[PDB]
Amino acid sequence: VDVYGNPIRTQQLREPQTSRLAGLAKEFAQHPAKGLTPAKLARILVEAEQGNLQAQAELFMDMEERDAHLFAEMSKRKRAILGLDWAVEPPRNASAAEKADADYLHELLLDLEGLEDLLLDALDGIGHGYSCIELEWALQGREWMPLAFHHRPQSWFQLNPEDQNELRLRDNSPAGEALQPFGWIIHRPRARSGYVARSGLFRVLAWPYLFRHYATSDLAEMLEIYGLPIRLGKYPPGTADEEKATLLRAVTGLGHAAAGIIPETMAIDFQQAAQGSSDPFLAMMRQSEDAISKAVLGGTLTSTTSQSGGGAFALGQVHNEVRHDLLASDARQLAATLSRDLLWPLLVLNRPGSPDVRRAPRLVFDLREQADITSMAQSIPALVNVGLEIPSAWVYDKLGIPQPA
């Protein structure tokens, strides 16, 4: 069975759950970001709270695509995880059989192509609040294998009417369809405590995005109007339609044309077009960008930048507060999700027996922080000459150097 105890039947693993839903694969995103107003955004969020996640997912995708600063921040945050070395470790004080199981799982993950793509797809749940990856199960003789990992759009799911924390497929029915066991890797990182609909970071970032969009569009319009002044022509009674058209064309082309002549009975008045500055717009854009940076990566390095300054402890100063905390949180949540969803089916299908769930191997990301070799290498000799018996295992582990074999 799975970790949650639901019965597992190997018959349903031959075909993906969504195969019998050919309607989903033919859908196109509705792009709800175009022509978006604060009222529309509020309605979208409220409806999403009630189980209509399609519009929210499409809006989040548009928001990711249309904002360069937000996209850069999210990409940097995800690439931070994608570059971490990982390993599979056996449970606490594991036995020889458990160690062998962990070693086999580690070897299987090393030789499993598409792991990086799986991690990238799973990390989308950081912003979207939940990411679902469908599994393709195949048999190369007697051992089950994940053939491929398919990332399904968040717009394909909904909320259970009887449960606000349980996701279901959109199968044209009011209650949707329950997710098949062992058929998905659902990643639901928890930045804030609440239901799944409210758990996305883009829900926090939506309003600054709209503020920045409005400011940028208004600035573009004002830059378009800038330049020549608006000038209005006046004509006396008894001016025919042809003369009216001639005066109109003359006024229209007068800005580009340096000189022109009109009868003394006519008049042209040059009125202010748009006089001001870009200061308010740019102030709003900077405020929104700082808010986005703080919300995504913390207000110590991105928005209120940590500035330059090297040194042996500079790495620690830059990392440990804010950056290390965020990195560790994301890595730990991703590792927990993976150990729950991918490691367990492999252990319970590819190996004999029914090992207890509490003793399953856990995937661990390498969060080791580079320690100053020179300072500590200076420090040891004094301590050892004093008489302290420092274990070599601690040194080898903390320095990153492996133990002799």
């Binding site: 309607g23 859908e27 009630q50 009417p161 959109r170 044209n172 029915s173 009011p174």
Partner: protein, 44 residues
């Protein structure tokens, strides 16, 4: 009776369709419409 001879390998297919929008599901569940509070216990 009702015949038609068409090409299939051409760059165009006869009687082309238009899936302008998907098969969106419209529902009337509970406190989302008035059919269920100021009305009978009806759902469409």
């Amino acid at each position: 009776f009702a015949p038609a001879a068409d090409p299939g390998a051409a760059w165009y297919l006869l009687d082309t369709s238009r899936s302008l929008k998907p098969l969106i599901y419209q529902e009337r569940m509970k406190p989302s419409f008035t059919s269920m509070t100021k009305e009978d216990d009806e759902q469409v």
